[PDB]
Design a protein around this nucleic acid. Sequence first.
RNA 1: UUUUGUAUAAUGGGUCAGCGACUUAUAUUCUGUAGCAAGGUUAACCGAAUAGGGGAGCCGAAGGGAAACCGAGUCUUAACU
RNA 2: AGGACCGAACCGACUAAUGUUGAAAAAUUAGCGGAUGACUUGUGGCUGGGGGUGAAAGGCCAAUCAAACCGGGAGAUAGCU
RNA 3: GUAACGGGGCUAAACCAUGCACCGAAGCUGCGGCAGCGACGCUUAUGCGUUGUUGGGUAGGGGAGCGUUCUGUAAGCCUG
RNA 4: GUUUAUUAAAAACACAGCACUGUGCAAACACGAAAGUGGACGUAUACGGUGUGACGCCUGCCCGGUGCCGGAAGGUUAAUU
RNA 5: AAUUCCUUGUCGGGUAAGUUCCGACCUGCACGAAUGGCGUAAUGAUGGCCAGGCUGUCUCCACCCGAGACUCAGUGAAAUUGAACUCGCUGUGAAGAUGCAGUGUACCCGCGGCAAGACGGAAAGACCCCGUGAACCUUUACUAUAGCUUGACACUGAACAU
RNA 6: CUUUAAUGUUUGAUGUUCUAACGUUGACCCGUAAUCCGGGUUGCGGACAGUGUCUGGUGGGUAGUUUGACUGGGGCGGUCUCCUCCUAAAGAGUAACGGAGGAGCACGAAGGUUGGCUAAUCCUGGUCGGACAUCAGGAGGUUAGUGCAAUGGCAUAAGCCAGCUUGACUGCGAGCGUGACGGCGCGAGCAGGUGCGAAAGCAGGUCAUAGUGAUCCGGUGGUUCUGAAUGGAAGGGCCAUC
Lengths: 64, 51, 76, 96
Amino acid sequence: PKIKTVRGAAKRFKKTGKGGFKHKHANLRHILTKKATKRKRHLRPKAMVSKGDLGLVIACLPYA
Amino acid sequence: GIREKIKLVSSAGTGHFYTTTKNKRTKPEKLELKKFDPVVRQHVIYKEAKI
Amino acid sequence: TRNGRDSEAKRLGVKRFGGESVLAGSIIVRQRGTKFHAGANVGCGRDHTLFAKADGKVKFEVKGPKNRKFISIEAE
Amino acid sequence: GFEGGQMPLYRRLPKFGFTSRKAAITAEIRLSDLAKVEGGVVDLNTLKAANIIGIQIEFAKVILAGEVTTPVTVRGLRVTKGARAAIEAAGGKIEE
RNA sequence: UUUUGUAUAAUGGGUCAGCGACUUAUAUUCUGUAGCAAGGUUAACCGAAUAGGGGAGCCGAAGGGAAACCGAGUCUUAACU
RNA sequence: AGGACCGAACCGACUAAUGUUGAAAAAUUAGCGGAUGACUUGUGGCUGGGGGUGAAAGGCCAAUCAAACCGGGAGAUAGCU
RNA sequence: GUAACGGGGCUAAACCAUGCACCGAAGCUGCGGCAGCGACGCUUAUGCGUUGUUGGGUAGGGGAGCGUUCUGUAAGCCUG
RNA sequence: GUUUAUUAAAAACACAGCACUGUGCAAACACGAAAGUGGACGUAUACGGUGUGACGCCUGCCCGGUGCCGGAAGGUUAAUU
RNA sequence: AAUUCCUUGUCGGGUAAGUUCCGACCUGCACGAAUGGCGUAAUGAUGGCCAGGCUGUCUCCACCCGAGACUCAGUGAAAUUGAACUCGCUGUGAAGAUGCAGUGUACCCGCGGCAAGACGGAAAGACCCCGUGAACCUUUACUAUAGCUUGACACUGAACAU
RNA sequence: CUUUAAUGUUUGAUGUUCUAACGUUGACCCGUAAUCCGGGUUGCGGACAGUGUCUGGUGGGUAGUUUGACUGGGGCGGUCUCCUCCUAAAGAGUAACGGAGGAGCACGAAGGUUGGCUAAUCCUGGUCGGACAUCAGGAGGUUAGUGCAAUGGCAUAAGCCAGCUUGACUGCGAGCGUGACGGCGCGAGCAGGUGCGAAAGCAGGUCAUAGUGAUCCGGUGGUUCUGAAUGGAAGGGCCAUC
Ligand SMILES: [Mg+2]
Ligand SMILES: [Mg+2]
Ligand SMILES: [Mg+2]
Ligand SMILES: [Mg+2]
Ligand SMILES: [Mg+2]
Ligand SMILES: [Mg+2]
Ligand SMILES: [Mg+2]
Ligand SMILES: [Mg+2]
Ligand SMILES: [Mg+2]
Ligand SMILES: [Mg+2]
Ligand SMILES: [Mg+2]
Ligand SMILES: [Mg+2]
Ligand SMILES: [Mg+2]
Ligand SMILES: [Mg+2]
Ligand SMILES: [Mg+2]
Ligand SMILES: [Mg+2]
Ligand SMILES: [Mg+2]
Ligand SMILES: [Mg+2]
Ligand SMILES: [Mg+2]
Ligand SMILES: [Mg+2]
Ligand SMILES: [Mg+2]
Ligand SMILES: [Mg+2]
Ligand SMILES: [Mg+2]
Ligand SMILES: [Mg+2]
Ligand SMILES: [Mg+2]
Ligand SMILES: [Mg+2]
Ligand SMILES: [Mg+2]
Ligand SMILES: [Mg+2]
Ligand SMILES: [Mg+2]
Ligand SMILES: [Mg+2]
Ligand SMILES: [Mg+2]
Ligand SMILES: [Mg+2]
Ligand SMILES: [Mg+2]
Ligand SMILES: [Mg+2]
Ligand SMILES: [Mg+2]
Ligand SMILES: [Mg+2]
Ligand SMILES: [Mg+2]
Ligand SMILES: [Mg+2]
Ligand SMILES: [Mg+2]
Ligand SMILES: [Mg+2]
Ligand SMILES: [Mg+2]
Ligand SMILES: [Mg+2]
Ligand SMILES: [Mg+2]
Ligand SMILES: [Mg+2]
């Protein structure tokens, strides 16, 4: 049978031009008043998945 | 703890608002501060409202 | 009452020693107070971290009447 | 994705975005694909017939990708700043 | 065999003979190898039946952005040194 | 007269020795309790598995019952050996 | 059960100091041989010849082979 | 009298007696998705449940908690509208 | 005390000597009234204690009669077993040695006996812990549910008052 | 009309009665040499009872399950996140049910800036007034102070006061530190706008290091995004926030 995608993983990662994966930062959903503007500002742009985590992401997204 | 979250709303008409805490017991009067509004790109007066 | 607690080590100390070539912005020393003070081309952060304000060589020196430690950056 | 019990990366991180249904029916044409149509006229039906784009594609863009050697007439297709210059330089024509 | 460590007074086997445990299918990635190469390959089916036909599709030659959209750029921001 | 007394058959099973790869997957021998009664037994019938039946011990339900046996789900699952 | 030098035994065969001999290992050297990796060659179809070096190993990774049954090569080849 | 057939026969279970409590009969209760039945071809001096356990002398105080019985004024309250 | 920890409580009785027994005291760790209290004649293969008789239970074993054991003839098992050329001692050592070191002792092979050892045999410890194992059991654990109970609508109509 | 009584009608509420649905585990007739059932008659009840769908309560009667880990065995006790010091062997890091403590907040000023100021403690003198209150002088020299634990800091003060104030700015960010990761931290400088200062300048909270909660789902506001025939809309995205 066809490999099934980890559907929750496909809702958080997106394959980029050079094979990597972009993802949204954690800590920007709620409890935002105590958080500094600087901290929240750096958390807005998407980020790349670290070396240690690519193996896990690639296993979850065979059709990425 | 005994300190509540409050929102400071822009008088410039724009929906923009800052967020802070307030000791509602000791300081019951509504908080007013001039803060930068990024929608009108100017420093306007901001007034307290409920979070 | 009972013991058993301790906090995480904060990895403080000297990050770049005398003579090391640094680019502007590089943290030279992470400290609790001003064990070292900011000298020429060296800035002081809010947590008293000393950093490079210009590219160059890290220089440690004892200056002033209070015989204080100062970190400066010499042009290379 | 199992990490021993620790909240996995595909769970620690938040979900984002939405899928555009429009993007699925929008295609891109390389300048190399203009010479591949039978007729010297490039439109949605021509590329479709030349098997450059899918049957269900409703919108297409010509981009500065590859080369255009022959004069061609692009009709009812969006063209990028660079691809316009490329088509025009080779004696081509761009119409709505 | 298991262990930090077993002549171990730890496990297992009376002996022989025959049997007895990393397979298969479909996906997917990588290495090797072969074909062709900005292309590569067809599926069902047709069949003149391992030929030939069939290019429906799939992957690749474009990315950026949540998206509209723009496009060798794009997004970020009113704008980026 | 009597869930009366002593005591064989008959029903039981308090003690001891033997036996424990037994003569026997619960017995033998010597003693022991009941023996007209809530007694004992033959033939046939009825109650069925979270169900029966139980003067109640989780007892008994075809030689291991805190959930029978057979077949099936079935190659349950086994981060253990 | 001697059983608090391993034993015999020892007045040094004990202890201290200086010295020279010898014994002693799968270490080092000698002779012969095989292979992995380099390098360079009488001179490359990718082997061979030199030559420096390496060559304990569980889990584990990598490389190279042997043999068994069945298909083609095979109506061939071997075999009363 | 009964009991752990197969390590417990007892002080354990049962028992006559006592009390509480339910039940007006198409009884309560029990087996049954139901039909049908047991209770009972009985009828409160009867039938079920629970406890105590011949007999003698007796069975005191506590209704706060938990459980049960009764109450209807107010407060809260479902589908529905 | 079928209840009492301290505890062999204390005192009395019984015995030469009594942690048990019987009587008593009350300081009831922690009796008590149908979760029944305290008595009770009779009954009991029921528990504790004392006495007479009686004896191989014992001092302390003797003898004897039978069935095995032992010998011959016939038949003919078993559990177990890595391989055995299968000794003592002291030491060493996966820390309790026939097998290692040192040393001692011992000619080769049976038969009858004994059980100190081969951590002897049997049963993948029942104790103990562990597994995000199993089961059955409890309850004011959680979530459901049969049953019981409440109302609304349906099967379900008419007349008349207020 | 101001107001009040009473006859007709609508839908309620409450009661009384009726019979015809429905009940009969009263009697009788027939099918029928039948204690079943069915049809019929009659009596007794009667829109009640009962059953279906929905609904609140009750419900170990039955069912499925959960009921943590660390631990000088386990259990009991204690502990589980964060901050500070020592153990820690003069870079970083470093364990134990090792030795000691603290956090889960506070503050619109206790934040920003300009200007100014300088403690503790002891001795001597002084109304009430004492060992210690306030005042004066001397010694002292930061031992004080820092909203709070500890450690490092702090006089150019970071300590204490006043005037003006909102930089407790929005977008970004060369370069670094620290993490397996998720993250977390430091940062000059650039753009827009602001406060204070004559100016150089300083300000992107508080001397620093604790004061915390991923994701999902959902709420509120904004929005050149999306909007399943089309225009809207719902819902989704994006930004802010709970
Ligand atoms: Mg959000
Ligand atoms: Mg096509
Ligand atoms: Mg061990
Ligand atoms: Mg060894
Ligand atoms: Mg062994
Ligand atoms: Mg064995
Ligand atoms: Mg074999
Ligand atoms: Mg009798
Ligand atoms: Mg007998
Ligand atoms: Mg008798
Ligand atoms: Mg008799
Ligand atoms: Mg029978
Ligand atoms: Mg029991
Ligand atoms: Mg299955
Ligand atoms: Mg299996
Ligand atoms: Mg000697
Ligand atoms: Mg010498
Ligand atoms: Mg050698
Ligand atoms: Mg070697
Ligand atoms: Mg009896
Ligand atoms: Mg028995
Ligand atoms: Mg018995
Ligand atoms: Mg009783
Ligand atoms: Mg009473
Ligand atoms: Mg009530
Ligand atoms: Mg007594
Ligand atoms: Mg014989
Ligand atoms: Mg042995
Ligand atoms: Mg054994
Ligand atoms: Mg075991
Ligand atoms: Mg009703
Ligand atoms: Mg319901
Ligand atoms: Mg319940
Ligand atoms: Mg249960
Ligand atoms: Mg289950
Ligand atoms: Mg544990
Ligand atoms: Mg250190
Ligand atoms: Mg060190
Ligand atoms: Mg301060
Ligand atoms: Mg100043
Ligand atoms: Mg004075
Ligand atoms: Mg000015
Ligand atoms: Mg539509
Ligand atoms: Mg539409």
